[PDB]
Amino acid sequence: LEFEKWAPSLNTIIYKGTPNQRHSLQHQIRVGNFDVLLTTYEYIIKDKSLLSKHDWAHMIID
DNA sequence: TCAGGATGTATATATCTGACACGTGCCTGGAGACTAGGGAGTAATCCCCTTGGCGGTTAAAACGCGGGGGACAGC
Numbered sequence: 001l002e003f004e005k006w007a008p009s010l011n012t013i014i015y016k017g018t019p020n021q022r023h024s025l026q027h028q029i030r031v032g033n034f035d036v037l038l039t040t041y042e043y044i045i046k047d048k049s050l051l052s053k054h055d056w057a058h059m060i061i062d
Numbered sequence: 063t064c065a066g067g068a069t070g071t072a073t074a075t076a077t078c079t080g081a082c083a084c085g086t087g088c089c090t091g092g093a094g095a096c097t098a099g100g101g102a103g104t105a106a107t108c109c110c111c112t113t114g115g116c117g118g119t120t121a122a123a124a125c126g127c128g129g130g131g132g133a134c135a136g137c
Contacts, residue, residue, distance in 0.1 A: 040118095041118095042117085042118060042119070046119080
């Protein structure tokens, strides 16, 4: 909500729900096509083979 | 389903023995007294592992449901 509210032009990526949704998503960002990735603890663990693979410029943990 | 009969089983009576109960003498194995020392009890610490619950996902359990193959009764 706050990402949208406070900023436009940010390709905000989120993880949630089913693996089907997460799969179609990973396709979208399989090349790093995003400005910011928002996710959670369970997905950075469960999808670490994808998320640790992708390099990071900056990480914020709330 | 019922009475007769043949067989078999059971039951009282001797009777007979050899296997069990009992007496006796011996002797060694168990009890008593005593000593040492080390194993076990007991206290104090500590810290690792167990337990109780929750969060979150997802494979698996549950459930219905049709239908064909085996269980089973008969002969």
